[PDB]
Target: Proactivator polypeptide
Amino acid sequence: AGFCEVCKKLVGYLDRNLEKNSTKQEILAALEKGCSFLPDPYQKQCDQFVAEYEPVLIEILVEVMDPSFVCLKIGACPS
Amino acid sequence: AGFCEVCKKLVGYLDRNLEKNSTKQEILAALEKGCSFLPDPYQKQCDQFVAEYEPVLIEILVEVMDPSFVCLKIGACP
Model:
């Protein structure tokens, strides 16, 4: 019904696997591979989420990588 | 454009599994099981698609069940 759960799973994977002082380019690269590392049921939903939110994801992730807060701030959560 | 391919895959499943004059109750039942029959990568996206579009899907599938046209008319495609 919404992108809230997939957003939190994806930002979780990034937070665990990226360092905090990653460049925008490094965040971009990771974001466009990260969906593949979520459980398979999430793949195409995650690809869609990333396509729709990619600009705002890049801009927030440089500052903060907390899954709950990032997803809240960008408007993916609640829903 | 986001839901276009999942819509066609799901309505594809319904087309294959429902007769032309299925009741709204029978279409609802199929629609709410259909996502589980699509390939694993499409599952969570299909659920979100069904949740978002379920009223209009019921509305149209009584009339027409062609995947491409149904998905176009409801606005999932292109």
